Design a protein around this motif. Structure first.
Motif, PDB file in Angstrom:
ATOM      1  N   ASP A   1       0.875  -1.170   0.000  1.00  0.00           N
ATOM      2  CA  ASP A   1       0.000   0.000   0.000  1.00  0.00           C
ATOM      3  C   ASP A   1       0.913   1.222   0.000  1.00  0.00           C
ATOM      4  N   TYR A   2       0.466   2.327  -0.601  1.00  0.00           N
ATOM      5  CA  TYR A   2       1.322   3.512  -0.659  1.00  0.00           C
ATOM      6  C   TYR A   2       1.765   4.034   0.704  1.00  0.00           C
ATOM      7  N   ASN A   3       0.895   3.970   1.707  1.00  0.00           N
ATOM      8  CA  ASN A   3       1.255   4.444   3.034  1.00  0.00           C
ATOM      9  C   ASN A   3       2.412   3.648   3.607  1.00  0.00           C
TER      10      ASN A   3
ATOM     11  N   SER B   1       6.081   5.071   4.466  1.00  0.00           N
ATOM     12  CA  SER B   1       6.687   4.917   5.787  1.00  0.00           C
ATOM     13  C   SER B   1       8.059   4.260   5.649  1.00  0.00           C
TER      14      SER B   1
END
Ligand SMILES: CCCCCCCC/C=C\CCCCCCCC(=O)OC[C@H](COP(=O)(O)OCCN)OC(=O)CCCCCCC/C=C\CCCCCCCC
Ligand SMILES: CCCCCCO[C@@H]1O[C@H](CO)[C@@H](O)[C@H](O)[C@H]1O
Lengths: 441, 48
Positions: free
Chosen positions: A432-434, A438
């Protein structure tokens, strides 16, 4: 001699300029062959949504006949003297070059001049190339690598000219008219936007006179209202995921915004990219490769291949990596890759940076091997830096890089920065992009 | 019957002040992370 004295023995590149603005540059050697060509500040970054693909269309027409040499006449002439004529278009540059015997330099320059100024653009030829281009679009669709890189630009530079592909959308290919092309040409193919470069067994003075003789008519004015200038292109932290479980391997490309051609930081960045390196299943090093990413990938069979890259444009760029792997290996690959960028930002060691520096030194010199690579370096350098950067300067720039410089430069472009991500294929496991974001800190 | 009376109310005020701070902040963290999903767009391109 030492590597140092050898550096100072490379003939200096000679540069001259005609009245119309055309720059003429050459590097003389004693090769009985040579490469001469025209590099132009023209590419899809200069195109709008209406004419995107115009430059590529012109590339298709460039060798199909000129007013002086209609149809296959240009072709027959090139072939009969055993020369080779080639071309390429990118988002910022276009080049047309010829490889020929040094003794044929005059005819080579004439042909290039003829190509760049008198292209026929016969309506019937335009219709034929229209179908050729459509078929090439279909073929390109089968190249997952080309697709993922076009996707990376589309998302990273969304809303700007750099988001556009070089070939253009298929509807533009179906609708571009001769008017559109002649228009594109009158606007971009001007002397001030071109560089006549040559490398091989020839003298600058001869090239210059041939340029005066064959390129003087080239316009060097244009005007004021029609001088295509480039606006900076905004970079956007984003993601584009084209899921296709029918494809056997996933392709992923990730990058942060690079500094652009002219920036001194590119050298340190190249060193860092050399440390991480490249890899593919046919490499003999395997578990012993120096790059942690390469040895982890090889011993754990994490990917078929991967490559770091530093794609530069005028004032921006894409700094990152591309990898090809099995659907169950994407997360692991992304984990190890990002971990390596972070290790370089915070803990690059003097020994690995020295290795990186040596890899870069070898790549630089081994790349300028032959009249074609040299001629291209001359043409492109003049367009980008406005000068040919000598090897002795490159060495000085590389020499200045140490572990401290690598940590600081990497931290500047990678640390806690938003990346652009493009995925294609069986990508259910692409993070996922998040989670990717991170991973940047 | 309730000697803790005054103290619970003092603690109550502090609890309210702390929640008045933390709730909007954590909610902002929630919206921040979810924005990736809330603005995503989909396209279906089946071969034809
Ligand atoms: C387990 C989680 C439950 C949290 C309970 C919060 C609580 O007991 O309140 C602590 C405290 C209240 O102030 P005091 O300094 O402890 O009172 C002295 C006043 N003279 O802080 C809070 O309310 C924190 C917010 C929750
Ligand atoms: C990081 C170092 C930036 C400045 C490097 C300049 O380097 C210098 O450039 C000159 C002109 O190209 C060369 O003639 C000279 O030999 C070279 O050492």
């Amino acid at each position: 001699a030492t590597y140092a004295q050898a550096l100072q023995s490379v003939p200096e590149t000679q540069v001259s300029q005609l009245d119309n603005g055309l720059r003429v540059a050459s590097e003389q050697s004693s090769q009985p062959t040579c490469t001469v060509g025209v590099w132009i500040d023209a590419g899809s970054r200069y195109e709008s949504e209406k004419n995107n693909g115009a430059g590529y269309f012109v590339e298709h027409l460039a060798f199909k006949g000129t007013k002086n040499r209609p149809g296959n006449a240009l072709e027959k002439e090139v072939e009969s003297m055993g020369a080779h004529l080639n071309a390429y278009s990118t988002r910022e540059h276009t080049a047309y070059y010829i490889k020929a015997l040094s003794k044929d330099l005059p005819k080579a320059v004439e042909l290039l001049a003829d190509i760049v100024q008198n292209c026929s653009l016969e309506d019937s030829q335009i219709e034929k190339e229209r179908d050729v281009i459509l078929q090439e679009l279909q073929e390109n669709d089968t190249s997952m690598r080309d697709v993922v890189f076009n996707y990376l630009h589309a998302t990273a530079f969304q809303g700007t000219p750099l988001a556009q592909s070089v070939e253009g959308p298929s509807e533009n290919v179906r609708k571009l008219s001769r008017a559109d092309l002649t228009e594109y040409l009158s606007r971009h193919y001007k002397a001030p936007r071109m560089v006549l470069a040559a490398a091989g067994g020839l003298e600058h003075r001869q090239l210059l006179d041939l340029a005066q003789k064959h390129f003087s008519g080239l316009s060097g004015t244009y005007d004021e209202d029609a001088v295509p200038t480039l606006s900076p292109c905004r970079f956007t932290g984003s993601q584009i995921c084209h899921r296709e479980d029918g494809l056997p391997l996933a392709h992923v490309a990730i990058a942060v915004e690079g500094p652009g051609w002219a920036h001194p930081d590119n050298v340190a960045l190249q060193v860092a990219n050399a440390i991480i390196g490249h890899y593919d299943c046919t490499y003999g090093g395997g578990a012993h490769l120096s790059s942690p990413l390469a040895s982890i990938a090889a011993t754990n069979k994490l990917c078929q291949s991967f490559q770091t890259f530093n794609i530069c444009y005028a004032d921006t760029g894409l700094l990152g990596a591309h990898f090809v792997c099995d659907h169950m290996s994407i997360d692991d690959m992304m984990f190890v890759l990002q971990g390596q960028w972070m290790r370089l930002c915070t803990s690059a060691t003097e020994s690995e940076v020295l290795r990186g520096k040596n890899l870069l030194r070898n790549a630089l010199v081994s790349h300028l091997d032959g009249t074609t690579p040299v001629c291209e370096d001359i043409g492109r350098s003049l367009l980008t830096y406005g000068r040919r950067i000598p090897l002795a300067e490159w060495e000085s720039r590389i020499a200045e890089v140490d572990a401290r410089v690598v940590r600081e430069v990497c931290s500047k472009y990678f640390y806690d920065q938003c990346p652009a991500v493009a995925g294609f294929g069986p990508i259910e496991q692409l993070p996922d992009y998040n989670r990717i974001r991170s991973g940047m800190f | 019957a309730e000697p803790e009376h005054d103290h619970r109310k003092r603690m109550g005020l502090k609890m309210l002040l702390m929640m008045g701070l933390l709730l909007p902040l954590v909610y902002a963290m929630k919206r921040h992370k979810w924005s990736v999903l809330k603005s995503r767009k989909l396209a279906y391109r089946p071969p034809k």
